[PDB]
Amino acid sequence: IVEGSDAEIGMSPWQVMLFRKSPQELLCGASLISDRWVLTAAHCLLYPPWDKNFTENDLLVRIGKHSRTRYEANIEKISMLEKIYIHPRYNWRENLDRDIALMKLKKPVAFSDYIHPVCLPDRETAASLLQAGYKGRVTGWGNLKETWTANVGKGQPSVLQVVNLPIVERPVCKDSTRIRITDNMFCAGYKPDEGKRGDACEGDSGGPFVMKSPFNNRWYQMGIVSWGEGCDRDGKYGFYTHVFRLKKWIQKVIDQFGE
Amino acid sequence: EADCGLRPLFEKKSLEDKTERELLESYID
Amino acid sequence: XXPXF
Ligand code: NA
CATH 1.20.1420.20 for domain A13-117+245-259? no
Enumerate residues 6+ apart whose C-beta is below 8 A from B21: none
CA distance A132 to A105: 35
Domain ranges of chain A: 1-12+118-244, 13-117+245-259
The number of CA neighbours under 13 Å toward the Cβ of A145 is 7
Does B contact A via 3+ CB–CB distances below 8 Å? Answer: yes
The candidate with the shortest Cα–Cα distance to A37, out of A119, A102, A115, A116, is A102
Identical fold for domains A1-12+118-244 and A13-117+245-259, yes or no, is: yes
For ligand 1, the distance from its centroid to the CA atom of residue A256, given in whole angstroms, is: 40
Q: State which amino acid sits at residue A7.
A: A
Fold (CATH) for A1-12+118-244: Thrombin, subunit H (2.40.10)
List Cα–Cα distances, A80 to A18, A37, A110, in angstroms.
10, 12, 14
Cα A97 from chain centroid (whole Å): 15
The candidate with the shortest Cα–Cα distance to A63, out of A25, A100, A22, A12, is A12
Q: State which amino acid sits at residue A217.
A: N
CA distance A68 to A116: 19
Which three-class secondary structure state does DSSP give residue A256? helix
CA distance A159 to A230: 22
Is the separation of the CB atoms in A3 and A233 below 8 Å? no
Instruction: Report CA Rg, chain C.
Output: 4
Domain span including residue B16 = 1-29
Q: Residue A11's CB: how many other CB atoms inside 10 A?
A: 21
Enumerate residues 6+ apart whose C-beta is below 8 A from B28: none
CA distance A114 to A195: 34
Resolution value, angstrom units:
1.8
* DSSP code string of A132-193: TT-EEEEEES--S-S---SS--S---SB-EEEEEEB--HHHHHHT-SS---TTEEEE-PPTT
Structure determined by: X-ray
CA distance A142 to A27: 9
Catalytic residue among A43, A66, A87, A242: A43
Specify the length of chain A in residues.
259
Which three-class secondary structure state does DSSP give residue B18? coil
How many domains does the structure of chain B reveal?
1
Identify the CATH number of the domain in which residue B1 sits. 4.10.140.10
For ligand 1, the distance from its centroid to the CA atom of residue A218, given in whole angstroms, is: 28
For ligand 1, the distance from its centroid to the CA atom of residue A155, given in whole angstroms, is: 19
- Neighbouring chains of A at 3+ CB pairs within 8 Å? B, C
3-class SS letters over A202-251: CCCCCCEEEEECCCCCCEEEEEEEEECCCCCCCCCCEEEEECHHHHHHHH
Which three-class secondary structure state does DSSP give residue A131? coil
Closest-CA distance of chain C to residue A82, Å: 27
